[PDB]
Amino acid sequence: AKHLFTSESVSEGHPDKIADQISDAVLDAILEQDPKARVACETYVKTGMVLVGGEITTSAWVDIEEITRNTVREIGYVHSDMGFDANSCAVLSAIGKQSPDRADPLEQGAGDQGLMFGYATNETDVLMPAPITYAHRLVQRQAEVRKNGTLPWLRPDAKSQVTFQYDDGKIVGIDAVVLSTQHSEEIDQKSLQEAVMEEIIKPILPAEWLTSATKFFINPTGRFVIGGPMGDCGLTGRKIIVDTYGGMARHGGGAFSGKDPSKVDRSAAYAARYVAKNIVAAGLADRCEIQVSYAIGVAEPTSIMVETFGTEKVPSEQLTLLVREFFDLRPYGLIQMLDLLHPIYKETAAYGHFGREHFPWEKTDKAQLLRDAAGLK
């Protein structure tokens, strides 16, 4: 049966992502010097202004200003006529520093409560929903061609949204595509439309999916010239769905960036991506969504639900069974199973935390063991 579904993505340099990247840049920077630092670092950015505020608990000494400005420059906001300059905006910070003050460390309990969700589906090479995969790929492409002089009239800020029509479970093709890139005053709009069609859209989207019918909307309102923080507000934790799975699978409250791995909100979610992906690369089901939860000071998850939406090749009790045998879902266990105490996190902060294959949670190393304990098959 037909039905359509949509998902959105935004580039590096959309204001909430500028915030996400800065936070994580500070997370990495401390993790480089002190892999066991506790950090929670929420950023806010606004037209003149980056306020990076935190509670951090570490040895490390790190230069918030310098870190901030460098990140703003990588994204490329470097002159007042863009809307924001990395070399002259104000960076205020408000980071409270705490200097660091059971038998089996794996038994330490959850830092805070929470529910968190993970998905995979075999609809993609990366085991991700197609819409969120393609939306991310449009916006990536736009930062790519910007950065590499191909299309150098184009400025950082940009959104993509792709809407896919499916008949039963099966992607039929692409009903609409929308892309809106900040660009210089130099280029004008029909010429831009050809360019993004040539260079961002046609080389990313599968042709078989595009038809005579695909409604494309490229800068629909025209002249997107000042963007980024100018006239807008980024805060960490706002593009929370884009981070995940574009609205295909569910979400607990929680944001990732600027939280170190002791934070279940990040880790437990990475681990759930990891269990669900392994469940599917193993041929245990076609789609798998999984809810974990935790309660403060208990170590075991208060809840595990698995939902393979009628797509299992083994009954489900047996599934949740081996969910538990192959995975240490306790707070310190996650951190062990995925080897998290490293400065890996800024790369996460833009184009999808998931679907991207060199992160510890994307590897399908438990594939076979899951298969051949799922009976033997």
Q: CA nearest 131: which of 245, 211, 241, 239?
A: 245
Q: How many residues of this chain interact with K ion, rule: CB under 5 A?
A: 5
Distance CA 219, CA 216 (A): 10
- Residue 305: beta bridge partners? 291
Q: In angstroms, rounded to a whole number, what is the distance separating the alpha carbons of residues 242 and 290?
A: 18
Of 234, 212, 250, nearest in space to 349 by CA: 234
Candidate residues 54, 258, 261, 331; the one interacting with K ion per rule CB under 5 A: 258
Environment class of residue 282 by beta-carbon count within 10 Å: exposed (0-12), middle (13-18) or buried (19+)? Answer: buried
16 binds Co ion (CB under 5 A): yes
Query: In angstroms, what is the minimal distance from the CB of 40 to Co ion?
Result: 8
| Residue 259, binding choice from Co ion, K ion, a copy of itself, none, Cβ under 5 to 8 Å by partner class | K ion
Binding mask 222-261 for a copy of itself (x = CB under 8 A): ---------xxx-xxxxxxxx---xxxxxxxx-x------
355 contact choice in K ion, Co ion, a copy of itself, none (CB below 5 to 8 Å, kind-dependent): none
Structure tokens at 291: 């809810």
Q: In angstroms, what is the minimal distance from the CB of 350 to Co ion?
A: 15
Q: Which of 117, 270, 274, 332 binds a copy of itself (CB under 8 A)?
A: 117
* Closest separation in Å from C-beta 276 to a copy of itself: 15
Q: Are 63 and 22 in contact (CB under 8 A)?
A: no
For 167, the enclosing helix (H) or strand (E) is: strand 154-167
The β-bridge relationship of strands 38-46 and 154-167 is unpaired
CA dihedral (81, 86, 89, 93) positive or negative: positive
Is residue 114 at the binding interface for a copy of itself, with CB under 8 A as the rule?
Answer: yes
Q: Which is nearer to Co ion, 260 or 362 (CB)?
A: 260
- Residue 100 touches a copy of itself, criterion: CB under 8 A: no
Q: Which is nearer to K ion, 37 or 255 (CB)?
A: 255
Residue 208 known to bind ligand: no
Pick the closest to residue 118 from 322, 354, 309, 321 (CA basis).
Answer: 354
The reply to whether 213 sits near a copy of itself by the rule CB under 8 A is: no
Site string for K ion, 210-239 (x = CB under 5 A): ---------------------------x--
Q: List b or e across 61-82, with b for residues whose CB sees 16 or more CB atoms inside 10 angstroms.
A: ebebeebbbebbebbbbeeeeb
Q: In angstroms, rounded to a whole number, what is the distance separating the alpha carbons of residues 42 and 33?
A: 20
Are 186 and 152 in contact, with CB atoms under 8 Å apart? no
303 binds, among Co ion, a copy of itself, K ion, none (CB under 5 to 8 A by kind): a copy of itself
Closest among 231, 143, 217 to 180, alpha carbons compared: 217
Any known ligand binding at 238? yes
Binding span for K ion by CB under 5 A among 50-58, 251-259, 268-276, 328-336: 251-259
Order of all β-strands in the sheet with 215-218: 3-10, 154-167, 170-183, 215-218
Within 302-361, which residues bind a copy of itself (CB under 8 A)? 302-307, 316
Q: Which residues pair with 140 in a beta bridge?
A: none
- Joined together, the tokens standing for residue 373 give 């304990």
3-state secondary structure of 47: coil
Nearer to a copy of itself, 36 or 251 (CB): 251
x-or-dash pattern for a copy of itself, window 160-199, by CB under 8 A?
-x-x-----------xx-x-x-------------------
Check binding of 243 to Co ion (CB under 5 A): no
* Binding region for Co ion (CB under 5 A): 16, 238, 254
Binding site for a copy of itself (CB under 8 A): 1, 3-8, 40, 42, 44, 46-47, 49, 51, 53-55, 94, 96, 113-115, 117, 159, 161, 163, 175-176, 178, 180, 215, 217, 220-221, 231-233, 235-242, 246-253, 255, 291, 293, 295-298, 302-307, 316
Q: Which residues bind K ion (CB under 5 A)?
A: 237, 240, 255, 258-259
